[PDB]
Amino acid sequence: MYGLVNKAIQDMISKHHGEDTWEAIKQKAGLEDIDFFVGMEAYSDDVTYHLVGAASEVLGKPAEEWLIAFGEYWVTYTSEEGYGELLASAGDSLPEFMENLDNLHARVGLSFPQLRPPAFECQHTSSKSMELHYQSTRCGLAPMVLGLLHGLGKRFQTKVEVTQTAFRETGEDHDIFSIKYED
Numbered sequence: 506m507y508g509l510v511n512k513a514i515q516d517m518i519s520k521h522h523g524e525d526t527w528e529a530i531k532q533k534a535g536l537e538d539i540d541f542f543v544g545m546e547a548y549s550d551d552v553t554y555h556l557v558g559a560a561s562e563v564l565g566k567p568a569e570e571w572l573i574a575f576g577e578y579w580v581t582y583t584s585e586e587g588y589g590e591l592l593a594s595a596g597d598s599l600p601e602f603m604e605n606l607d608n609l610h611a612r613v614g615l616s617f618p619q620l621r622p623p624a625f626e627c628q629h630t631s632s633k634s635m636e637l638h639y640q641s642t643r644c645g646l647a648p649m650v651l652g653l654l655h656g657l658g659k660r661f662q663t664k665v666e667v668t669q670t671a672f673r674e675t676g677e678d679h680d681i682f683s684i685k686y687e688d
């Protein structure tokens with residue numbers, strides 16, 4: 506993934522746990538040589554998965570749980586590190602934002618030419634609920650999506666109840682979530 510993602514990981518770990526903890530994770534991930542991540546440069550996805558695994562081990566958290574926190578963090582990180590106006594432009598509510606997400610990533614992809622963005626499709630079941638389809642070229646990121654949804658809930662001061670109903674990993678086509686939301 507692009508360096509930006511790995512920078513967010515480093516920043517979250519450093520902020521929540523300290524530089525020493527980050528260094529331990531970075532070493533454990535096999536990344537000691539890398540002095541810094543380059544935000545607009547592409548890295549092997551392996552770099553990210555290794556950080557997740559190393560974070561899980563050092564912190565003593567399940568990786569899924571850690572990925573949820575990271576997904577929530579991303580919503581704040583992007584808004585603060587150069588993508589605040591882009592985020593704002595994608596909407597004023599959770600369901601509008603999710604409808605705009607593919608277009609938001611298309612905009613990102615203008616600048617990040619190698620982007621492999623996720624694809625999100627909404628099927629609205631009421632004015633306060635939807636079924637969300639998450640399609641990706643990558644494995645393992647559903648729990649990050651859960652955190653992102655909670656991050657968006659906070660952003661829009663909206664209560665969000667989310668349950669995963671289909672699993673990419675268990676052979677099923679793609680991840681699907683049932684979501685209810687209210688003010």
Ligand code: HEM
Pocket residue numbers: 506507509510579580583584588591592606610613617619620621622623640641642643646649650653654657
């Ligand atoms: C705020 C709501 C957002 C959600 C829910 C979201 C969702 C995701 C997800 C799930 C991925 C994982 C990649 C995959 O599934 O294959 C991803 C990747 C990525 N996103 Fe978004 N995203 C959001 C906002 C943003 C914003 C504001 C930016 C601005 C830079 C951004 C840029 C990226 C980048 C650079 C990647 C790495 C993909 C790659 O390197 O190929 N995202 N996003």
Ligand SMILES: [Xe]
Pocket residue numbers: 510579
């Ligand atoms: Xe991300």
Ligand SMILES: [Xe]
Pocket residue numbers: 510553557575649
């Ligand atoms: Xe990640």
